[PDB]
Design a protein around this ligand. Structure first.
Ligand SMILES: C[C@]12CC[C@@H]3c4ccc(O)cc4CC[C@H]3[C@@H]1CC[C@@H]2O
Lengths: 238, 9
């Protein structure tokens, strides 16, 4: 059914499916107090991420087990791009929530997190410099969930791979349509598509580094880990 | 099974 949507319906769909912005629990942070807040926040946002996924056009047509494998490998890239996007208009700060605006220096309060902040901030500026739009943003977040684990899913898997690649193509049509409607020159549209798609690369990299840090902090008993968040943490190692 | 219970609901 999803394969039959126009560029405008897919855009609308995705715009309606966006999850809400959550708040953080209420002098200087400690290593433990700071991971406790981020973790308590990421754990509340995954429940919302599960229900945003289901509304992404085409996701529910996958076998349950492909649905899990996809959320299981993309959860931290989806959390990262939402963060970058809400931090866009606050140069030098990461807006974890409306009541938790952290800067590079607070990043130093937790061992080895500053490098992770530094990359989130650089992607945040990158998106500011290109002037990313909300319509584009929603398309990117869907490509990220569909491209997390297609090379990690044999006759029903090749069938599920093709359906997945068909959604990806429609999302690629949508993005091309958004840029045409804002008057980009034909040349300019593929230059911007490719620039958006190379930032996903960086996002994948922030993610792998993010899992490592998380799992380090967990193995040092620095933070207890939430039920849904632990489950998802374990899908990567395991 | 957290994730699964939420895909079925
Ligand atoms: C997983 C981490 C804590 C939770 C953090 C979070 C928590 C909520 C959120 O919306 C985004 C992010 C992105 C960075 C995440 C961090 C990456 C390293 C760290 O361990």
């Amino acid at each position: 059914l999803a394969l039959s949507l126009t560029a405008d319906q897919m855009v609308s769909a995705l715009l309606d499916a966006e999850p809400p912005i959550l708040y953080s629990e209420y002098r200087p942070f400690s290593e433990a107090s700071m991971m406790g807040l981020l973790t308590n926040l990421a754990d509340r946002e995954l429940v919302h991420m599960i229900n945003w996924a289901k509304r992404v056009p085409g996701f529910v047509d996958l076998t349950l087990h492909d649905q899990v494998h996809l959320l299981e490998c993309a959860w931290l890239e989806i959390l990262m791009i939402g963060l970058v996007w809400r931090s866009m208009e606050h140069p030098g700060k990461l807006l974890f929530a409306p009541n938790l605006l952290l800067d590079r220096n607070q990043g130093k309060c937790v061992e080895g997190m500053v490098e992770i902040f530094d990359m989130l901030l650089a992607t945040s500026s990158r998106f500011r410099m290109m002037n990313l739009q909300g319509e584009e943003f929603v398309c990117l977040k869907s490509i990220i969930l569909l491209n997390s684990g297609v090379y990690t899913f044999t006759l029903k898997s090749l069938e599920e791979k093709d359906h997945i690649h068909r959604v990806l193509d429609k999302i690629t049509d949508t993005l091309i349509h958004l840029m045409a409607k804002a008057g980009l020159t034909l040349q300019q549209q593929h230059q911007r598509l490719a620039q958006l798609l190379l930032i996903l690369s960086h996002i994948r990299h922030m993610s792998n580094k993010g899992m490592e840090h998380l799992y380090s902090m967990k193995c040092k008993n620095v933070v207890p880990l939430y039920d849904l968040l632990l489950e998802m943490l374990d899908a990567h190692r395991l | 099974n957290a994730l699964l219970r939420y895909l079925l609901d």
